[PDB]
């Protein structure tokens, strides 16, 4: 696969709308589906399972705002390599009828989801309309699904990745950015507790 000639910025930018991310406070019981470590800024999740990510703003972005998610390798020497699904999963029969079979990150439960293969940078990304929080709610939740394990040979192959979440206006202008590390693994709860053990 062709390397990208560029690397997306991962610099945090709250912007005019005071944009940042939140995650459920899920703990590390062995049963948890998805769990986020504030100390590591790292989400631990399972293949193809719901991964809630919260959008928090201080003021409401204008109508037509969109929310984009994109993965990059965390290690500088792999950064120009496009993060994609391994050949095995690229060929498996788990299509949801909306997502490209090579894309690592999907969004579930949203029929307005849109996927992009960037024709210049080669990066994959997934975008949904920004929706303000339901009345009485403090944030907007997106349900992401990661469609390969961190260990997948011929794919991520045990290399750490970051998900970059950006807010953009209807014309593509950057309004906000935040990011977090992701490990897609068999037992998120155990793995988080173990990785934090090294602190
Ligand atoms: Zn895979």
mmCIF file with all atom_site columns, C-alpha atoms and ligand atoms in Angstrom:
data_model
loop_
_atom_site.group_PDB
_atom_site.id
_atom_site.type_symbol
_atom_site.label_atom_id
_atom_site.label_alt_id
_atom_site.label_comp_id
_atom_site.label_asym_id
_atom_site.label_entity_id
_atom_site.label_seq_id
_atom_site.pdbx_PDB_ins_code
_atom_site.Cartn_x
_atom_site.Cartn_y
_atom_site.Cartn_z
_atom_site.occupancy
_atom_site.B_iso_or_equiv
_atom_site.pdbx_formal_charge
_atom_site.auth_seq_id
_atom_site.auth_comp_id
_atom_site.auth_asym_id
_atom_site.auth_atom_id
_atom_site.pdbx_PDB_model_num
ATOM   1   C  CA  . UNK A 1 1   ? 0.000   0.000   0.000  1.00 0.00 ? 1   UNK A CA  1
ATOM   2   C  CA  . UNK A 1 2   ? 1.127   3.558   -0.810 1.00 0.00 ? 2   UNK A CA  1
ATOM   3   C  CA  . UNK A 1 3   ? 2.402   5.648   2.082  1.00 0.00 ? 3   UNK A CA  1
ATOM   4   C  CA  . UNK A 1 4   ? 0.854   9.048   2.733  1.00 0.00 ? 4   UNK A CA  1
ATOM   5   C  CA  . UNK A 1 5   ? 2.918   12.101  1.869  1.00 0.00 ? 5   UNK A CA  1
ATOM   6   C  CA  . UNK A 1 6   ? 1.617   13.852  4.998  1.00 0.00 ? 6   UNK A CA  1
ATOM   7   C  CA  . UNK A 1 7   ? 0.642   13.252  8.629  1.00 0.00 ? 7   UNK A CA  1
ATOM   8   C  CA  . UNK A 1 8   ? -2.534  14.645  10.244 1.00 0.00 ? 8   UNK A CA  1
ATOM   9   C  CA  . UNK A 1 9   ? -1.886  16.975  13.171 1.00 0.00 ? 9   UNK A CA  1
ATOM   10  C  CA  . UNK A 1 10  ? -2.687  15.531  16.584 1.00 0.00 ? 10  UNK A CA  1
ATOM   11  C  CA  . UNK A 1 11  ? -2.416  18.870  18.431 1.00 0.00 ? 11  UNK A CA  1
ATOM   12  C  CA  . UNK A 1 12  ? -5.317  19.466  20.822 1.00 0.00 ? 12  UNK A CA  1
ATOM   13  C  CA  . UNK A 1 13  ? -7.404  22.477  19.794 1.00 0.00 ? 13  UNK A CA  1
ATOM   14  C  CA  . UNK A 1 14  ? -10.517 23.441  21.722 1.00 0.00 ? 14  UNK A CA  1
ATOM   15  C  CA  . UNK A 1 15  ? -11.386 26.229  19.300 1.00 0.00 ? 15  UNK A CA  1
ATOM   16  C  CA  . UNK A 1 16  ? -14.284 28.683  19.370 1.00 0.00 ? 16  UNK A CA  1
ATOM   17  C  CA  . UNK A 1 17  ? -16.791 26.121  20.652 1.00 0.00 ? 17  UNK A CA  1
ATOM   18  C  CA  . UNK A 1 18  ? -14.673 24.784  23.529 1.00 0.00 ? 18  UNK A CA  1
ATOM   19  C  CA  . UNK A 1 19  ? -14.558 21.321  22.014 1.00 0.00 ? 19  UNK A CA  1
ATOM   20  C  CA  . UNK A 1 20  ? -13.315 18.346  23.978 1.00 0.00 ? 20  UNK A CA  1
ATOM   21  C  CA  . UNK A 1 21  ? -13.911 14.637  24.427 1.00 0.00 ? 21  UNK A CA  1
ATOM   22  C  CA  . UNK A 1 22  ? -15.419 12.644  27.252 1.00 0.00 ? 22  UNK A CA  1
ATOM   23  C  CA  . UNK A 1 23  ? -15.699 8.924   27.943 1.00 0.00 ? 23  UNK A CA  1
ATOM   24  C  CA  . UNK A 1 24  ? -17.879 6.823   30.229 1.00 0.00 ? 24  UNK A CA  1
ATOM   25  C  CA  . UNK A 1 25  ? -16.288 6.159   33.622 1.00 0.00 ? 25  UNK A CA  1
ATOM   26  C  CA  . UNK A 1 26  ? -16.478 2.411   33.115 1.00 0.00 ? 26  UNK A CA  1
ATOM   27  C  CA  . UNK A 1 27  ? -13.888 0.931   35.470 1.00 0.00 ? 27  UNK A CA  1
ATOM   28  C  CA  . UNK A 1 28  ? -11.846 -2.206  34.819 1.00 0.00 ? 28  UNK A CA  1
ATOM   29  C  CA  . UNK A 1 29  ? -14.039 -5.194  35.688 1.00 0.00 ? 29  UNK A CA  1
ATOM   30  C  CA  . UNK A 1 30  ? -13.265 -8.117  33.344 1.00 0.00 ? 30  UNK A CA  1
ATOM   31  C  CA  . UNK A 1 31  ? -16.756 -7.792  31.873 1.00 0.00 ? 31  UNK A CA  1
ATOM   32  C  CA  . UNK A 1 32  ? -16.401 -4.233  30.518 1.00 0.00 ? 32  UNK A CA  1
ATOM   33  C  CA  . UNK A 1 33  ? -16.833 -3.814  26.740 1.00 0.00 ? 33  UNK A CA  1
ATOM   34  C  CA  . UNK A 1 34  ? -14.975 -0.507  26.427 1.00 0.00 ? 34  UNK A CA  1
ATOM   35  C  CA  . UNK A 1 35  ? -12.891 1.302   29.049 1.00 0.00 ? 35  UNK A CA  1
ATOM   36  C  CA  . UNK A 1 36  ? -10.914 4.562   28.979 1.00 0.00 ? 36  UNK A CA  1
ATOM   37  C  CA  . UNK A 1 37  ? -7.812  5.376   31.009 1.00 0.00 ? 37  UNK A CA  1
ATOM   38  C  CA  . UNK A 1 38  ? -7.449  9.083   31.839 1.00 0.00 ? 38  UNK A CA  1
ATOM   39  C  CA  . UNK A 1 39  ? -3.881  8.534   33.075 1.00 0.00 ? 39  UNK A CA  1
ATOM   40  C  CA  . UNK A 1 40  ? -2.849  6.972   29.737 1.00 0.00 ? 40  UNK A CA  1
ATOM   41  C  CA  . UNK A 1 41  ? -5.301  8.940   27.583 1.00 0.00 ? 41  UNK A CA  1
ATOM   42  C  CA  . UNK A 1 42  ? -6.074  5.532   26.124 1.00 0.00 ? 42  UNK A CA  1
ATOM   43  C  CA  . UNK A 1 43  ? -9.231  3.678   25.182 1.00 0.00 ? 43  UNK A CA  1
ATOM   44  C  CA  . UNK A 1 44  ? -9.267  -0.120  25.548 1.00 0.00 ? 44  UNK A CA  1
ATOM   45  C  CA  . UNK A 1 45  ? -11.994 -1.784  23.472 1.00 0.00 ? 45  UNK A CA  1
ATOM   46  C  CA  . UNK A 1 46  ? -13.048 -4.988  21.715 1.00 0.00 ? 46  UNK A CA  1
ATOM   47  C  CA  . UNK A 1 47  ? -13.283 -5.880  18.033 1.00 0.00 ? 47  UNK A CA  1
ATOM   48  C  CA  . UNK A 1 48  ? -16.557 -4.764  16.457 1.00 0.00 ? 48  UNK A CA  1
ATOM   49  C  CA  . UNK A 1 49  ? -18.153 -3.733  19.770 1.00 0.00 ? 49  UNK A CA  1
ATOM   50  C  CA  . UNK A 1 50  ? -19.671 -0.401  20.846 1.00 0.00 ? 50  UNK A CA  1
ATOM   51  C  CA  . UNK A 1 51  ? -17.147 2.247   21.832 1.00 0.00 ? 51  UNK A CA  1
ATOM   52  C  CA  . UNK A 1 52  ? -18.868 5.382   23.160 1.00 0.00 ? 52  UNK A CA  1
ATOM   53  C  CA  . UNK A 1 53  ? -17.105 8.713   22.646 1.00 0.00 ? 53  UNK A CA  1
ATOM   54  C  CA  . UNK A 1 54  ? -18.631 11.916  24.018 1.00 0.00 ? 54  UNK A CA  1
ATOM   55  C  CA  . UNK A 1 55  ? -18.483 15.359  22.442 1.00 0.00 ? 55  UNK A CA  1
ATOM   56  C  CA  . UNK A 1 56  ? -18.577 18.261  24.891 1.00 0.00 ? 56  UNK A CA  1
ATOM   57  C  CA  . UNK A 1 57  ? -18.818 21.890  23.757 1.00 0.00 ? 57  UNK A CA  1
ATOM   58  C  CA  . UNK A 1 58  ? -19.050 25.184  25.658 1.00 0.00 ? 58  UNK A CA  1
ATOM   59  C  CA  . UNK A 1 59  ? -21.207 26.704  22.925 1.00 0.00 ? 59  UNK A CA  1
ATOM   60  C  CA  . UNK A 1 60  ? -23.115 25.142  20.064 1.00 0.00 ? 60  UNK A CA  1
ATOM   61  C  CA  . UNK A 1 61  ? -21.372 24.825  16.677 1.00 0.00 ? 61  UNK A CA  1
ATOM   62  C  CA  . UNK A 1 62  ? -23.358 26.172  13.723 1.00 0.00 ? 62  UNK A CA  1
ATOM   63  C  CA  . UNK A 1 63  ? -25.756 24.007  11.710 1.00 0.00 ? 63  UNK A CA  1
ATOM   64  C  CA  . UNK A 1 64  ? -23.967 21.801  9.191  1.00 0.00 ? 64  UNK A CA  1
ATOM   65  C  CA  . UNK A 1 65  ? -21.085 21.017  11.525 1.00 0.00 ? 65  UNK A CA  1
ATOM   66  C  CA  . UNK A 1 66  ? -19.549 17.570  11.070 1.00 0.00 ? 66  UNK A CA  1
ATOM   67  C  CA  . UNK A 1 67  ? -17.487 15.265  13.313 1.00 0.00 ? 67  UNK A CA  1
ATOM   68  C  CA  . UNK A 1 68  ? -14.631 13.285  11.746 1.00 0.00 ? 68  UNK A CA  1
ATOM   69  C  CA  . UNK A 1 69  ? -12.616 10.349  13.153 1.00 0.00 ? 69  UNK A CA  1
ATOM   70  C  CA  . UNK A 1 70  ? -9.293  9.134   11.722 1.00 0.00 ? 70  UNK A CA  1
ATOM   71  C  CA  . UNK A 1 71  ? -6.651  6.710   12.994 1.00 0.00 ? 71  UNK A CA  1
ATOM   72  C  CA  . UNK A 1 72  ? -2.895  7.120   12.724 1.00 0.00 ? 72  UNK A CA  1
ATOM   73  C  CA  . UNK A 1 73  ? -0.008  5.075   14.065 1.00 0.00 ? 73  UNK A CA  1
ATOM   74  C  CA  . UNK A 1 74  ? 1.299   6.473   17.353 1.00 0.00 ? 74  UNK A CA  1
ATOM   75  C  CA  . UNK A 1 75  ? 4.971   5.731   16.676 1.00 0.00 ? 75  UNK A CA  1
ATOM   76  C  CA  . UNK A 1 76  ? 6.584   8.445   14.540 1.00 0.00 ? 76  UNK A CA  1
ATOM   77  C  CA  . UNK A 1 77  ? 8.293   5.934   12.237 1.00 0.00 ? 77  UNK A CA  1
ATOM   78  C  CA  . UNK A 1 78  ? 4.942   4.456   11.192 1.00 0.00 ? 78  UNK A CA  1
ATOM   79  C  CA  . UNK A 1 79  ? 3.006   7.688   10.912 1.00 0.00 ? 79  UNK A CA  1
ATOM   80  C  CA  . UNK A 1 80  ? 2.951   7.933   7.117  1.00 0.00 ? 80  UNK A CA  1
ATOM   81  C  CA  . UNK A 1 81  ? 1.577   4.380   6.888  1.00 0.00 ? 81  UNK A CA  1
ATOM   82  C  CA  . UNK A 1 82  ? -2.190  4.459   6.413  1.00 0.00 ? 82  UNK A CA  1
ATOM   83  C  CA  . UNK A 1 83  ? -4.031  2.643   9.212  1.00 0.00 ? 83  UNK A CA  1
ATOM   84  C  CA  . UNK A 1 84  ? -6.283  0.074   7.581  1.00 0.00 ? 84  UNK A CA  1
ATOM   85  C  CA  . UNK A 1 85  ? -7.800  -3.333  8.263  1.00 0.00 ? 85  UNK A CA  1
ATOM   86  C  CA  . UNK A 1 86  ? -5.735  -6.482  7.788  1.00 0.00 ? 86  UNK A CA  1
ATOM   87  C  CA  . UNK A 1 87  ? -6.278  -8.636  4.673  1.00 0.00 ? 87  UNK A CA  1
ATOM   88  C  CA  . UNK A 1 88  ? -8.206  -11.210 6.694  1.00 0.00 ? 88  UNK A CA  1
ATOM   89  C  CA  . UNK A 1 89  ? -10.772 -8.698  7.931  1.00 0.00 ? 89  UNK A CA  1
ATOM   90  C  CA  . UNK A 1 90  ? -10.804 -6.740  4.680  1.00 0.00 ? 90  UNK A CA  1
ATOM   91  C  CA  . UNK A 1 91  ? -12.125 -9.970  3.102  1.00 0.00 ? 91  UNK A CA  1
ATOM   92  C  CA  . UNK A 1 92  ? -14.395 -11.213 5.917  1.00 0.00 ? 92  UNK A CA  1
ATOM   93  C  CA  . UNK A 1 93  ? -18.183 -11.023 5.718  1.00 0.00 ? 93  UNK A CA  1
ATOM   94  C  CA  . UNK A 1 94  ? -18.924 -8.421  8.378  1.00 0.00 ? 94  UNK A CA  1
ATOM   95  C  CA  . UNK A 1 95  ? -20.002 -5.571  6.094  1.00 0.00 ? 95  UNK A CA  1
ATOM   96  C  CA  . UNK A 1 96  ? -22.720 -3.367  7.568  1.00 0.00 ? 96  UNK A CA  1
ATOM   97  C  CA  . UNK A 1 97  ? -23.613 -2.223  4.069  1.00 0.00 ? 97  UNK A CA  1
ATOM   98  C  CA  . UNK A 1 98  ? -22.401 1.306   4.786  1.00 0.00 ? 98  UNK A CA  1
ATOM   99  C  CA  . UNK A 1 99  ? -18.677 1.079   5.620  1.00 0.00 ? 99  UNK A CA  1
ATOM   100 C  CA  . UNK A 1 100 ? -15.790 0.410   3.184  1.00 0.00 ? 100 UNK A CA  1
ATOM   101 C  CA  . UNK A 1 101 ? -14.340 -3.035  3.887  1.00 0.00 ? 101 UNK A CA  1
ATOM   102 C  CA  . UNK A 1 102 ? -10.815 -1.632  4.427  1.00 0.00 ? 102 UNK A CA  1
ATOM   103 C  CA  . UNK A 1 103 ? -11.804 0.976   7.031  1.00 0.00 ? 103 UNK A CA  1
ATOM   104 C  CA  . UNK A 1 104 ? -10.741 0.374   10.644 1.00 0.00 ? 104 UNK A CA  1
ATOM   105 C  CA  . UNK A 1 105 ? -13.203 2.787   12.247 1.00 0.00 ? 105 UNK A CA  1
ATOM   106 C  CA  . UNK A 1 106 ? -16.964 2.574   11.739 1.00 0.00 ? 106 UNK A CA  1
ATOM   107 C  CA  . UNK A 1 107 ? -19.909 4.386   13.299 1.00 0.00 ? 107 UNK A CA  1
ATOM   108 C  CA  . UNK A 1 108 ? -22.982 2.372   14.305 1.00 0.00 ? 108 UNK A CA  1
ATOM   109 C  CA  . UNK A 1 109 ? -26.567 3.533   14.770 1.00 0.00 ? 109 UNK A CA  1
ATOM   110 C  CA  . UNK A 1 110 ? -26.351 6.512   12.413 1.00 0.00 ? 110 UNK A CA  1
ATOM   111 C  CA  . UNK A 1 111 ? -27.674 6.341   8.862  1.00 0.00 ? 111 UNK A CA  1
ATOM   112 C  CA  . UNK A 1 112 ? -26.117 9.720   8.047  1.00 0.00 ? 112 UNK A CA  1
ATOM   113 C  CA  . UNK A 1 113 ? -22.618 8.294   8.458  1.00 0.00 ? 113 UNK A CA  1
ATOM   114 C  CA  . UNK A 1 114 ? -20.227 9.085   5.625  1.00 0.00 ? 114 UNK A CA  1
ATOM   115 C  CA  . UNK A 1 115 ? -16.879 7.449   4.775  1.00 0.00 ? 115 UNK A CA  1
ATOM   116 C  CA  . UNK A 1 116 ? -13.911 8.963   2.919  1.00 0.00 ? 116 UNK A CA  1
ATOM   117 C  CA  . UNK A 1 117 ? -10.830 7.596   1.168  1.00 0.00 ? 117 UNK A CA  1
ATOM   118 C  CA  . UNK A 1 118 ? -8.875  10.837  0.829  1.00 0.00 ? 118 UNK A CA  1
ATOM   119 C  CA  . UNK A 1 119 ? -7.725  10.961  -2.783 1.00 0.00 ? 119 UNK A CA  1
ATOM   120 C  CA  . UNK A 1 120 ? -4.668  13.100  -1.954 1.00 0.00 ? 120 UNK A CA  1
ATOM   121 C  CA  . UNK A 1 121 ? -3.510  11.891  1.468  1.00 0.00 ? 121 UNK A CA  1
ATOM   122 C  CA  . UNK A 1 122 ? -4.846  8.320   1.150  1.00 0.00 ? 122 UNK A CA  1
ATOM   123 C  CA  . UNK A 1 123 ? -6.146  8.450   4.752  1.00 0.00 ? 123 UNK A CA  1
ATOM   124 C  CA  . UNK A 1 124 ? -9.434  6.776   5.721  1.00 0.00 ? 124 UNK A CA  1
ATOM   125 C  CA  . UNK A 1 125 ? -11.935 8.632   7.871  1.00 0.00 ? 125 UNK A CA  1
ATOM   126 C  CA  . UNK A 1 126 ? -15.523 8.457   9.030  1.00 0.00 ? 126 UNK A CA  1
ATOM   127 C  CA  . UNK A 1 127 ? -17.747 11.487  9.491  1.00 0.00 ? 127 UNK A CA  1
ATOM   128 C  CA  . UNK A 1 128 ? -21.193 12.143  10.952 1.00 0.00 ? 128 UNK A CA  1
ATOM   129 C  CA  . UNK A 1 129 ? -23.324 15.270  11.364 1.00 0.00 ? 129 UNK A CA  1
ATOM   130 C  CA  . UNK A 1 130 ? -22.738 17.059  14.643 1.00 0.00 ? 130 UNK A CA  1
ATOM   131 C  CA  . UNK A 1 131 ? -25.949 16.904  16.658 1.00 0.00 ? 131 UNK A CA  1
ATOM   132 C  CA  . UNK A 1 132 ? -26.367 19.040  19.764 1.00 0.00 ? 132 UNK A CA  1
ATOM   133 C  CA  . UNK A 1 133 ? -27.036 17.113  23.001 1.00 0.00 ? 133 UNK A CA  1
ATOM   134 C  CA  . UNK A 1 134 ? -30.590 15.962  23.653 1.00 0.00 ? 134 UNK A CA  1
ATOM   135 C  CA  . UNK A 1 135 ? -32.264 18.422  26.017 1.00 0.00 ? 135 UNK A CA  1
ATOM   136 C  CA  . UNK A 1 136 ? -31.251 17.638  29.587 1.00 0.00 ? 136 UNK A CA  1
ATOM   137 C  CA  . UNK A 1 137 ? -28.062 15.998  28.333 1.00 0.00 ? 137 UNK A CA  1
ATOM   138 C  CA  . UNK A 1 138 ? -24.591 17.525  28.643 1.00 0.00 ? 138 UNK A CA  1
ATOM   139 C  CA  . UNK A 1 139 ? -22.870 15.893  25.667 1.00 0.00 ? 139 UNK A CA  1
ATOM   140 C  CA  . UNK A 1 140 ? -23.321 14.202  22.302 1.00 0.00 ? 140 UNK A CA  1
ATOM   141 C  CA  . UNK A 1 141 ? -22.376 10.532  22.133 1.00 0.00 ? 141 UNK A CA  1
ATOM   142 C  CA  . UNK A 1 142 ? -21.064 8.733   19.064 1.00 0.00 ? 142 UNK A CA  1
ATOM   143 C  CA  . UNK A 1 143 ? -20.850 4.931   18.968 1.00 0.00 ? 143 UNK A CA  1
ATOM   144 C  CA  . UNK A 1 144 ? -17.649 3.912   17.209 1.00 0.00 ? 144 UNK A CA  1
ATOM   145 C  CA  . UNK A 1 145 ? -16.666 0.365   16.259 1.00 0.00 ? 145 UNK A CA  1
ATOM   146 C  CA  . UNK A 1 146 ? -13.057 -0.717  15.686 1.00 0.00 ? 146 UNK A CA  1
ATOM   147 C  CA  . UNK A 1 147 ? -12.987 -3.505  13.104 1.00 0.00 ? 147 UNK A CA  1
ATOM   148 C  CA  . UNK A 1 148 ? -9.528  -5.024  13.669 1.00 0.00 ? 148 UNK A CA  1
ATOM   149 C  CA  . UNK A 1 149 ? -7.587  -6.086  16.734 1.00 0.00 ? 149 UNK A CA  1
ATOM   150 C  CA  . UNK A 1 150 ? -4.370  -4.274  17.598 1.00 0.00 ? 150 UNK A CA  1
ATOM   151 C  CA  . UNK A 1 151 ? -2.692  -7.666  17.161 1.00 0.00 ? 151 UNK A CA  1
ATOM   152 C  CA  . UNK A 1 152 ? -3.970  -8.304  13.624 1.00 0.00 ? 152 UNK A CA  1
ATOM   153 C  CA  . UNK A 1 153 ? -1.099  -9.572  11.476 1.00 0.00 ? 153 UNK A CA  1
ATOM   154 C  CA  . UNK A 1 154 ? -0.764  -7.707  8.192  1.00 0.00 ? 154 UNK A CA  1
ATOM   155 C  CA  . UNK A 1 155 ? -2.735  -4.893  9.771  1.00 0.00 ? 155 UNK A CA  1
ATOM   156 C  CA  . UNK A 1 156 ? -1.911  -2.951  12.910 1.00 0.00 ? 156 UNK A CA  1
ATOM   157 C  CA  . UNK A 1 157 ? 0.300   -5.888  13.895 1.00 0.00 ? 157 UNK A CA  1
ATOM   158 C  CA  . UNK A 1 158 ? 0.669   -4.835  17.555 1.00 0.00 ? 158 UNK A CA  1
ATOM   159 C  CA  . UNK A 1 159 ? 1.547   -1.227  16.760 1.00 0.00 ? 159 UNK A CA  1
ATOM   160 C  CA  . UNK A 1 160 ? -0.276  1.406   18.885 1.00 0.00 ? 160 UNK A CA  1
ATOM   161 C  CA  . UNK A 1 161 ? -2.666  3.812   17.174 1.00 0.00 ? 161 UNK A CA  1
ATOM   162 C  CA  . UNK A 1 162 ? -4.283  7.137   17.971 1.00 0.00 ? 162 UNK A CA  1
ATOM   163 C  CA  . UNK A 1 163 ? -7.784  8.191   17.001 1.00 0.00 ? 163 UNK A CA  1
ATOM   164 C  CA  . UNK A 1 164 ? -8.028  11.875  16.082 1.00 0.00 ? 164 UNK A CA  1
ATOM   165 C  CA  . UNK A 1 165 ? -11.475 13.405  16.437 1.00 0.00 ? 165 UNK A CA  1
ATOM   166 C  CA  . UNK A 1 166 ? -12.058 16.696  14.594 1.00 0.00 ? 166 UNK A CA  1
ATOM   167 C  CA  . UNK A 1 167 ? -14.968 19.115  14.451 1.00 0.00 ? 167 UNK A CA  1
ATOM   168 C  CA  . UNK A 1 168 ? -15.351 20.792  11.064 1.00 0.00 ? 168 UNK A CA  1
ATOM   169 C  CA  . UNK A 1 169 ? -17.831 23.257  9.553  1.00 0.00 ? 169 UNK A CA  1
ATOM   170 C  CA  . UNK A 1 170 ? -19.984 22.413  6.542  1.00 0.00 ? 170 UNK A CA  1
ATOM   171 C  CA  . UNK A 1 171 ? -17.151 23.548  4.257  1.00 0.00 ? 171 UNK A CA  1
ATOM   172 C  CA  . UNK A 1 172 ? -14.446 21.464  5.941  1.00 0.00 ? 172 UNK A CA  1
ATOM   173 C  CA  . UNK A 1 173 ? -12.831 24.196  8.038  1.00 0.00 ? 173 UNK A CA  1
ATOM   174 C  CA  . UNK A 1 174 ? -11.241 22.844  11.225 1.00 0.00 ? 174 UNK A CA  1
ATOM   175 C  CA  . UNK A 1 175 ? -13.105 23.950  14.376 1.00 0.00 ? 175 UNK A CA  1
ATOM   176 C  CA  . UNK A 1 176 ? -11.663 21.678  17.057 1.00 0.00 ? 176 UNK A CA  1
ATOM   177 C  CA  . UNK A 1 177 ? -9.414  18.666  17.572 1.00 0.00 ? 177 UNK A CA  1
ATOM   178 C  CA  . UNK A 1 178 ? -8.787  16.049  20.265 1.00 0.00 ? 178 UNK A CA  1
ATOM   179 C  CA  . UNK A 1 179 ? -7.192  12.610  20.241 1.00 0.00 ? 179 UNK A CA  1
ATOM   180 C  CA  . UNK A 1 180 ? -6.693  9.441   22.253 1.00 0.00 ? 180 UNK A CA  1
ATOM   181 C  CA  . UNK A 1 181 ? -4.708  6.226   22.044 1.00 0.00 ? 181 UNK A CA  1
ATOM   182 C  CA  . UNK A 1 182 ? -6.658  3.031   21.265 1.00 0.00 ? 182 UNK A CA  1
ATOM   183 C  CA  . UNK A 1 183 ? -5.957  -0.627  21.989 1.00 0.00 ? 183 UNK A CA  1
ATOM   184 C  CA  . UNK A 1 184 ? -8.379  -3.110  20.483 1.00 0.00 ? 184 UNK A CA  1
ATOM   185 C  CA  . UNK A 1 185 ? -7.957  -6.267  22.547 1.00 0.00 ? 185 UNK A CA  1
ATOM   186 C  CA  . UNK A 1 186 ? -9.604  -9.390  23.980 1.00 0.00 ? 186 UNK A CA  1
ATOM   187 C  CA  . UNK A 1 187 ? -10.043 -8.120  27.542 1.00 0.00 ? 187 UNK A CA  1
ATOM   188 C  CA  . UNK A 1 188 ? -10.092 -4.301  27.883 1.00 0.00 ? 188 UNK A CA  1
ATOM   189 C  CA  . UNK A 1 189 ? -10.600 -4.336  31.670 1.00 0.00 ? 189 UNK A CA  1
ATOM   190 C  CA  . UNK A 1 190 ? -7.627  -6.543  32.459 1.00 0.00 ? 190 UNK A CA  1
ATOM   191 C  CA  . UNK A 1 191 ? -5.436  -4.829  29.880 1.00 0.00 ? 191 UNK A CA  1
ATOM   192 C  CA  . UNK A 1 192 ? -6.110  -1.322  31.228 1.00 0.00 ? 192 UNK A CA  1
ATOM   193 C  CA  . UNK A 1 193 ? -5.504  -2.391  34.813 1.00 0.00 ? 193 UNK A CA  1
ATOM   194 C  CA  . UNK A 1 194 ? -2.261  -4.077  33.741 1.00 0.00 ? 194 UNK A CA  1
ATOM   195 C  CA  . UNK A 1 195 ? -0.955  -1.157  31.668 1.00 0.00 ? 195 UNK A CA  1
ATOM   196 C  CA  . UNK A 1 196 ? -1.701  1.298   34.484 1.00 0.00 ? 196 UNK A CA  1
ATOM   197 C  CA  . UNK A 1 197 ? 0.171   -1.049  36.824 1.00 0.00 ? 197 UNK A CA  1
ATOM   198 C  CA  . UNK A 1 198 ? 3.285   0.307   35.119 1.00 0.00 ? 198 UNK A CA  1
ATOM   199 C  CA  . UNK A 1 199 ? 2.768   3.768   36.632 1.00 0.00 ? 199 UNK A CA  1
HETATM 200 ZN ZN1 . LIG B 2 .   ? -7.788  -7.580  11.344 1.00 0.00 ? 1   LIG B ZN1 1
#
